[PDB]
């Protein structure tokens, strides 16, 4: 947990200041995007889209006054600029996906995610209630889409590429 999260160049991932792509280690051809779920008219669910690579970049945020991220820190994860709080991830019950990753326009001081070493990269883990037990984020295939959703024991493994191409 005291491990510092690093990018694909081996540099510490910054606290909010820089954006990064979550690149799947065995799905580098696909990338994060927003899609519709349920009956919703606006796309608010996060999917791994085979048509976008590297996909939408994220920022990892902790209220701590440090400019690196450790695996033990509770994080918010968000799309978009530091200055905007649209694009903030949360996990929301939504049939029939299950506990789906969705974007919201509000942000708690302490987010519910951690980034934890797994295999050749990192997994995203969701901690309901910011408690002790974490649930792995993996993929749920429904409606011809691969939604990011809780799939405990079957995480999607990512490497973290700094978004200097933009």
């Amino acid at each position: 947990g005291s491990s510092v999260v690093v990018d694909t160049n081996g540099q510490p991932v910054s606290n909010g200041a820089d954006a990064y792509y979550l690149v799947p280690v065995s799905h580098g051809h696909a990338g994060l995007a927003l899609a519709k779920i349920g009956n919703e008219a606006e796309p608010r669910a996060v999917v791994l889209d085979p048509h976008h690579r590297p996909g939408l970049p994220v920022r990892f945020e902790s209220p701590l006054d440090i400019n690196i991220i450790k695996e033990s820190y509770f994080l918010n994860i968000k799309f978009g600029p530091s200055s905007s709080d649209s694009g903030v991830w949360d996990v929301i019950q939504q049939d029939p996906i299950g506990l789906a990753v969705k974007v919201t326009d509000t942000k708690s001081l302490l987010g519910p995610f951690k980034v934890e070493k797994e295999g050749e990269g990192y997994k995203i883990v969701y901690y309901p209630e910011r408690g002790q037990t974490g649930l792995d984020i993996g993929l749920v295939h429904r409606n011809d889409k691969y939604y990011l959703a809780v799939k405990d024991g079957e995480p999607c493994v990512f490497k973290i590429r700094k978004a200097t191409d933009e």
Binding site: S2, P63, I66, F74
Partner: protein
């Protein structure tokens, strides 16, 4: 440090730089010749610590020392509740010779006084989002426990206190973690956390309330 200025060189000779592959990630405070106090969230299995610095280039800083440390002890209640009890003690591999540019500071025994103006120093981000070349200093004022709890409940815990939030937008920022807040001549706090972005009017930063830990610090150092 947001909306501060360069420190008068070597005016904060207890300031410690914690560096990882030649880049600063936190600060700490020299409290005894062999001990540096910092935020527990800055914990690493080993450290390289810069003392006597102004710029972070030791090869341009006469009187500076870059020292190794292996042992550190997080407060046993760190992060229970979340973000609380945010302090650790780092034992240097060897005691340093104190000088006019490397010197310990006494810790406040009395708790913070609402309204009091204090000084915070560090090498963290400026208002423009860049890192400074030399240590920055700024004044921030202690806010009442009533205001701290109103803004931060349910995460406010008396191992914390709040300072800043002025119209002046003076604040600590990322990379200032673990550094000192000095009040009325004594170490009163460590930079801990805040609501982002830094330097918002009406939103003070949060500091570790060291007056609560003077016994644990003393016992740890003496053990």
């Amino acid at each position: 440090i947001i909306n501060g200025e360069d420190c008068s060189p070597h005016s904060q000779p207890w300031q410690a730089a914690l560096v990882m592959e030649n880049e600063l990630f936190c600060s700490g405070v020299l409290v005894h010749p062999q001990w540096v106090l910092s935020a527990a969230h800055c914990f690493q299995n080993s450290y390289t610590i810069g003392l006597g610095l102004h710029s972070l280039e030791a090869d341009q800083e006469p009187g500076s020392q870059m020292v190794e440390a292996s042992l550190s002890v997080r407060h046993p209640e760190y992060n229970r509740p979340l973000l609380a009890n945010d302090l650790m003690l780092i034992k240097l591999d060897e005691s340093v010779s104190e000088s006019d540019t490397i010197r310990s500071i006494s810790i406040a025994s009395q708790c913070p006084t609402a309204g009091n103006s204090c000084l915070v120093s560090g090498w963290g981000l400026l208002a423009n989002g860049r890192m400074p070349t030399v240590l920055q200093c700024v004044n921030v004022s202690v806010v009442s426990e009533e205001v701290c709890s109103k803004l931060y409940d349910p995460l406010y815990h008396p191992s914390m206190f709040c300072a800043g939030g002025g119209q002046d937008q003076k604040d600590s920022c990322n990379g200032d973690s673990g550094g000192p807040l000095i009040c009325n001549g004594y170490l009163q706090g460590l930079v801990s956390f805040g609501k982002a972005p830094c330097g918002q009017v009406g939103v003070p930063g949060v500091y570790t309330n060291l007056c609560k830990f003077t016994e644990w610090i003393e016992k740890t150092v003496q053990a």
